[PDB]
């Protein structure tokens, strides 16, 4: 009839979009730096919304991938490089009966340029290869080495990402919710929660927890060459621990360059490694393979075996405990063939020089931490890998580092508001 | 009414989401509160947000819609844009669907709304020229 | 702009229960009403009642309150506007006298004065 058309300014219509995220706090990651966050958490439901999710085209784990990586960089700027380190190194064993941690020794540059000085330090065999006993740091070969500034910190900050003006994040309320599909209730919200930055490896630590029953993911379950990320509902605890207690040589090696070494071993030379319940996790390798029979079969064999090979990032569990960076042999979590007090305790190795992520160009030299290490933390989550009939095996991998965020920001997307509409009714202008 | 909140109505009709304008009008620009990461990348959306606000003022100026949260216009409604009844769109789909439909015929009908006001404020010249 | 089927042509004999079920697609099942009517050999046509697959309420004839057995599921979302849900419909004291085709109709509005109206009908369910 007599329609015409009529604009509406502000009206509730978005599209999928993805723009620069900025972030907000309450250390390496310089969360002091970001805008302090609210106090007040508006979270505004999205009645009768059905929005179609997908955590694996997600772009703000390929944003906070870069915005970490950038994070790294942006704070070894101004921290000591070690390039004199790269020298004719002298070691021995530390006395004791496996010989791992060395002695090591070798003539330093001073703060004077004509003076030199034969001082020595502990160096772990990871960090050093042999000549032909003589010995060189490892990345010397391969690329520069920057010494960690030690008054900055690497624990992880609750990090909440928040969409600019006229944009926004789509929550997904959705308790049974796998990575992709359709999210029946979903909600709005100004700002993600607090994000962990936690680098772990295999087993996923210090994340959030899955309410009701423990999920899996991965984007086809059917595509063995897709890391599958499983979600515990209960937590298990592991503890962890370094327990030599280690000292800290400072080593003028210029004017204000101070490289900081590992003396001696004040006491007990022990082992470093990790425990965990095997009640809790034999019961929480039982929710795991309950959900996998609804992918794979009620009847079919769901066999966990180890890494099968690669790099020591992978093949080991590999995080951070007090300051430095263990690789937890994780064979002892996975050996068991499921069909239908406790304590396990895993050997874990440290290193000092390490590239993190998988980047080539620069490897950084973390600091010894005085005094006993040891941390409590929980494992939340997993990532496996399985391997030709009706019986399938499961290994840990952990090869991209971005499936980490991607276990906390599957419950977001991005989205740009679009307030132009234009639709008739009878309404005319006069003249 | 139910303050439903910022974007509450996005299931709604568009009969009820229509009412609840000044919501979503408020929120569009947020407001207020040096050169590290988030610190060029926050003013960098943070003049992102000024320039996707302007343009749908701009937009709104030049159709003679400018301070408007509902605007009548002149432009006739084509039924080659949607040939659906006024009963079966206000108190049916929602906001999200409509847009859908009209994805396509949402350029034509902007270049409607402008020669519609240019012709407006010269009619409206020539009217007060005596 | 989706379709209602139900079930096949069950036939029983009094006193006995029947259920009746209604399968939707094309359509976000909790936004329209979900009306139940019959034509019977005897009378024309009457109006049973409807239920809101949103709301849950339920509103009958007093000729089938004490009667009708009207349950719904929860639909499975395919996207953000189309959906899978499920009305039931049973009766409890059966006489020759229902024997009748039964269809399930979608409300025809989600607001206004015409928001449960049967729209979109199913296909038919020949009872005893």
């Known amino acids: 009839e007599n329609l015409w058309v009529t604009v509406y300014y502000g009206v509730p219509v978005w599209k999928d979009a993805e723009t620069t995220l900025f972030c907000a706090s309450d250390n390496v990651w310089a969360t002091h730096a970001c805008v302090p966050t609210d106090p007040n958490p508006q979270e505004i439901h999205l009645e009768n919304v059905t929005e179609e999710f997908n955590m694996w085209k997600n772009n703000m784990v390929e944003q906070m991938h870069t915005d970490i990586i950038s994070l790294w960089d942006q704070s070894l700027k101004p921290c000591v490089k070690l390039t004199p380190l790269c020298v004719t190194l002298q070691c021995t064993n530390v006395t004791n009966a496996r010989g791992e941690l060395k002695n090591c020794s070798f003539n330093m540059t001073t703060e004077l340029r004509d003076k030199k000085q034969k001082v020595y330090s502990l160096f772990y065999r990871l960090d050093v290869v042999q000549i032909n006993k003589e010995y060189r740091l490892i990345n010397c070969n391969t690329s520069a080495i920057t010494q960690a500034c030690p008054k900055v910190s690497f624990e992880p900050i609750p990090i909440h990402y928040c969409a600019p003006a006229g944009f926004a994040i789509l929550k997904c309320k959705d308790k049974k919710f796998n990575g992709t599909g359709p999210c029946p209730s979903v909600s709005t919200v100004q700002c993600t929660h607090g994000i962990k930055p936690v680098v772990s490896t295999q087993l996923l630590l210090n994340g959030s927890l899955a309410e009701e029953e423990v999920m899996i993911r991965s984007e086809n379950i059917t595509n063995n060459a897709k890391n599958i990320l499983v979600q515990f509902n209960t937590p298990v605890q592991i503890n962890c621990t370094r327990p030599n207690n280690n000292t800290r040589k400072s080593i003028r090696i210029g004017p204000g360059q101070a490289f900081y070494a590992t003396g001696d071993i004040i006491g007990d030379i022990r082992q470093a490694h990790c425990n965990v319940s095997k009640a809790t996790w034999n019961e929480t390798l039982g929710k795991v393979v309950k959900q996998l029979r609804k992918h794979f079969g009620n009847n079919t064999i769901i066999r966990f075996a180890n890494s099968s090979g690669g790099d020591l990032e992978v093949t080991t569990h590999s995080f951070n405990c007090g300051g430095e960076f263990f690789y937890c042999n994780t064979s002892g979590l996975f050996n068991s063939t499921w069909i239908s007090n406790d304590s396990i305790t895993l050997p874990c190795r440290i290193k000092q020089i390490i590239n993190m992520w998988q980047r080539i160009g620069q490897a950084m030299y973390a600091p010894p931490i005085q005094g006993v290490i040891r941390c409590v933390s929980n494992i939340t989550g997993l990532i496996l890998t399985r391997d030709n009939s009706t019986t399938e095996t499961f290994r840990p991998g952990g090869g991209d580092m971005r499936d980490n965020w991607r276990s906390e920001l599957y419950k977001y997307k991005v989205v740009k508001i679009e307030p132009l509409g234009v639709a008739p009714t009878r309404c005319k202008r006069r003249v | 009414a139910v303050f439903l909140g910022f974007l509450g109505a996005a299931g709604s009709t568009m009969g009820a989401a229509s009412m609840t304008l000044t919501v979503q009008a408020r929120n569009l620009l947020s407001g207020i509160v040096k050169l590290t990461v988030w610190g060029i990348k926050q003013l960098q959306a943070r003049v992102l947000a000024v320039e996707r606000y302007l343009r749908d003022q701009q937009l709104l100026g030049i159709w003679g819609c400018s301070g408007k949260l509902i605007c009548c216009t002149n432009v006739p409604w084509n039924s080659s844009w949607s040939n659906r009844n006024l009963s079966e769109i206000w108190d049916n789909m929602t906001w999200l669907q409509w847009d859908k439909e009209i994805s396509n015929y949402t350029q034509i009908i902007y270049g409607l709304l402008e020669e519609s006001q240019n012709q407006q404020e010269k009619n409206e010249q020539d009217l007060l020229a005596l | 702009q989706g379709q209602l089927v139900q079930s096949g042509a069950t036939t029983t004999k009094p006193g006995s229960s029947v259920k009746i079920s209604c399968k939707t697609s094309?359509?976000?099942?909790?936004?329209?009403?979900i009306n139940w009517i019959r034509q019977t050999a005897g009378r024309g046509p009457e109006w049973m009642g409807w239920?809101?697959?949103?709301?849950?309420?339920?509103?009958?004839?007093?000729?089938?309150?004490?009667r009708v057995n009207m349950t719904t599921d929860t639909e499975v979302p395919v996207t953000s506007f189309t959906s899978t849900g499920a009305a039931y419909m049973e009766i409890r004291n059966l006489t020759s006298d229902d024997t009748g085709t039964y269809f399930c109709?979608?409300?025809?509005?989600?607001?206004?004065?015409?928001?449960?109206?049967?729209?979109?009908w199913g296909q038919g369910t020949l009872l005893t």
């Open positions: 239920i809101s697959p949103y709301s849950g309420d339920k509103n009958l004839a007093p000729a089938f309150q004490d």
């Open positions: 094309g359509y976000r099942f909790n936004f329209y009403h």
């Open positions: 109709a979608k409300g025809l509005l989600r607001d206004g004065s015409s928001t449960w109206l049967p729209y979109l």
